[PDB]
Every structure is written in structure tokens, then in C-alpha cells.
Ligand binder design. Sequence first.
Ligand SMILES: NC(=O)c1ccc[n+]([C@@H]2O[C@H](COP(=O)([O-])OP(=O)(O)OC[C@H]3O[C@@H](n4cnc5c(N)ncnc54)[C@H](OP(=O)(O)O)[C@@H]3O)[C@@H](O)[C@H]2O)c1
Length: 180
Amino acid sequence: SGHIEGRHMAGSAEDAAFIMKNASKVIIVPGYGMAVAQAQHALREMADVLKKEGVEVSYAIHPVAGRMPGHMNVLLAEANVPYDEVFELEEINSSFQTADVAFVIGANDVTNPAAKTDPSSPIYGMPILDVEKAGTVLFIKRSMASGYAGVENELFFRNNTMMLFGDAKKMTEQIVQAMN
Ligand SMILES: NC(=O)c1ccc[n+]([C@@H]2O[C@H](COP(=O)([O-])OP(=O)(O)OC[C@H]3O[C@@H](n4cnc5c(N)ncnc54)[C@H](OP(=O)(O)O)[C@@H]3O)[C@@H](O)[C@H]2O)c1
């Protein structure tokens, strides 16, 4: 079950399931990690279970999420994710405040303000996804390791942030199992 370690909260697949299954609105934020693990299909399945529970689901895509422009968009289309449920940062970033949960799967730098300080990086000076504005922020990643930018993400310490350590595909599959 869930336990606190260091300055962060480490939740479990069941915690994630319980929280999202009982939320009214969830915003999914995919990143590099989802591509490494090819978790898009499991992710779309999870969204299906949630929508079946009456939960409102949508996806927020950062301009440089992943490792090529439009990387997340093609992976989501691949998983048969409804095109209308996918939004670019500029048109969904203001919606995080009205969201109960921000499901960040395999993303880091695109939610980190400290990531766009390097002029040699693709994300330099770009806006960031305000996942904090949501009731709860769930991060799926294998550890507390940094992203491409190589900088710490302080969101991992916020009060409304729960870390779900594990492979993006494996963890998402466990969440799906715990849900139905
Ligand atoms: N999109 C482009 O065109 C492009 C091109 C070149 C560079 N970039 C740069 O790449 C970055 C993109 O950011 P982002 O949030 O998408 O990615 P990111 O910050 O580079 O990384 C996201 C996270 O995925 C986790 N991860 C890795 N393998 C995983 C797995 N198998 N399962 C679950 N999690 C896994 C990582 O941590 P763990 O080790 O903890 O799992 C990592 O912190 C930005 O800094 C951007 O500027 C973008």
C-alpha cells in the first residue's frame, strides 16, 4: 500500500485506481516514458474503464513531449484514442484547475518549470503544463530520476503529488486490473 519515503508520497496501483475511479474529471499527460514502454494501448484501455465509470477524460500534449514533434499524438492515434479527446497545451493548460486528477504517465520535463532554463534544449522558454492546478497529480515513472533536461522536479514534493513507481506499461496495466 501507499507509504511516505523522503520528501515524497509513494502510492500504489490501487491508490491510483481508487482516486481516478472516483474522480469526476481526469487529464492524462503522456511523455517520453510512455514511448519507451509503449504503454499507449494500456493507457487507452484505462481511459475506457474510467469513461465507462462516467469519468471525464482528456489528454494534454506538450509541444516537445517525447523525442520528436507530435510524438505523443501518433502514439495515441495508434492506440485508437479518440482524436477529439487529445488537446495541445495552449488549449487545455487552463483546464487543469478544473481537473480532479492529472495522470502524468512517463512525463517529467514538460511539467517542470526548471526544465526550460537551458538554451540548448528543445523546451527552452516554452510554456509548461500546470498539472499542479489539478486536485491530485499522479506521476508514473520508474524512480525519482530526472528527465532529458537533467534537472530536479519540485512537483514530486508538493502536497497534492503522488508518485507511482514502476514501468509505464506495467503500472498502467496493474491500475487497469485494480479498477475492474
Ligand atoms: N519532442 C522533441 O522533439 C524532443 C527532441 C529532443 C529532445 N526533447 C526533450 O526531451 C524532453 C521531453 O520531456 P517529457 O516529459 O516527455 O520526457 P523526459 O522529461 O525526458 O522524461 C520523462 C520520464 O520518463 C521516465 N521513464 C523512462 N523510461 C520509462 C519507462 N520504461 N516507464 C516509465 N517511465 C519511464 C523517466 O524517468 P525514470 O527513470 O524515473 O523512469 C523520465 O523522467 C524535454 O526536456 C524536451 O525538450 C524533445
